[PDB]
Amino acid sequence: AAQTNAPWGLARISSTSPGTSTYYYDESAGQGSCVYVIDTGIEASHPEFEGRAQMVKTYYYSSRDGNGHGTHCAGTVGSRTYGVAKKTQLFGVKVLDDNGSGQYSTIIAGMDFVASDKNNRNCPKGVVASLSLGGGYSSSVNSAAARLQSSGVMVAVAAGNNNADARNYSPASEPSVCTVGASDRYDRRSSFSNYGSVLDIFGPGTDILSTWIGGSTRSISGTSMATPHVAGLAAYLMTLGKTTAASACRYIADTANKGDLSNIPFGTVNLLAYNNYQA
Numbered sequence: 001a002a003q004t005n006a007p008w009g010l011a012r013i014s015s016t017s018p019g020t021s022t023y024y025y026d027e028s029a030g031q032g033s034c035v036y037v038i039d040t041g042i043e044a045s046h047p048e049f050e051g052r053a054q055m056v057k058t059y060y061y062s063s064r065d066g067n068g069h070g071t072h073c074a075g076t077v078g079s080r081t082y083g084v085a086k087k088t089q090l091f092g093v094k095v096l097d098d099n100g101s102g103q104y105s106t107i108i109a110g111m112d113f114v115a116s117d118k119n120n121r122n123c124p125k126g127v128v129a130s131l132s133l134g135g136g137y138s139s140s141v142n143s144a145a146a147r148l149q150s151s152g153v154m155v156a157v158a159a160g161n162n163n164a165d166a167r168n169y170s171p172a173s174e175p176s177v178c179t180v181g182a183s184d185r186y187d188r189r190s191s192f193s194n195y196g197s198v199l200d201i202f203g204p205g206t207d208i209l210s211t212w213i214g215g216s217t218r219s220i221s222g223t224s225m226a227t228p229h230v231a232g233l234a235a236y237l238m239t240l241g242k243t244t245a246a247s248a249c250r251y252i253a254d255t256a257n258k259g260d261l262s263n264i265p266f267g268t269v270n271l272l273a274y275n276n277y278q279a
């Protein structure tokens, strides 16, 4: 399949080179996989989701995304126009309030919720979780992310936006998950992206067009935007049978575009997520 005039980040993850605008992907498009978006919620009624999105848990008085961030992330995972895995099922877990913040205890509870809830969902090709959140180092937050990954979910987490070593942030610093840095359309490390030996992969994170609340769209930037590109890529690859939840991060790193990013500090991977699709 070919989607012309796609958002630059979609075009980038199916290209060996920057500067193109068509997204190429196998038409299976993540069908039969599931992605949990653990964030501010998802505006499921948005047509871009085509009935494939649903809120499954909230820790607040409503399950509505009153912020937009979770809707944007979900859109990069799996919206029809802005998504990597255009046929995946999307499940929203609202651990962040409408101001975009959440207590670590609530975030931990939402991770444990996903580890159990996947047993209530039909995801024959596999389960992914996209965590575009984080704060300072917490061993409890890291151990919750580790449990989620151990349960058989491919966990993708944002590296953080501190232009610092991700070793000091959670869940970014949990070794066993897939920690995602951000790049821009000219293949630079995004100025704000964290770095360090705990990163597994980079994805597009600067000026990312996706869905927003009120049935709208907008471009925004962050490692929060890079993470759902990798989560959607994992779902896509698991539907194609190329990898499994336990192996997807390594598979993505093995098949990534290698050595092509600028402003990568010594000791940080220079790997950019790539779907290797050959039509």
Ligand SMILES: [Ca+2]
Pocket: 174, 175, 176, 177, 178, 179, 198, 199, 200, 249
């Ligand atoms: Ca890792």
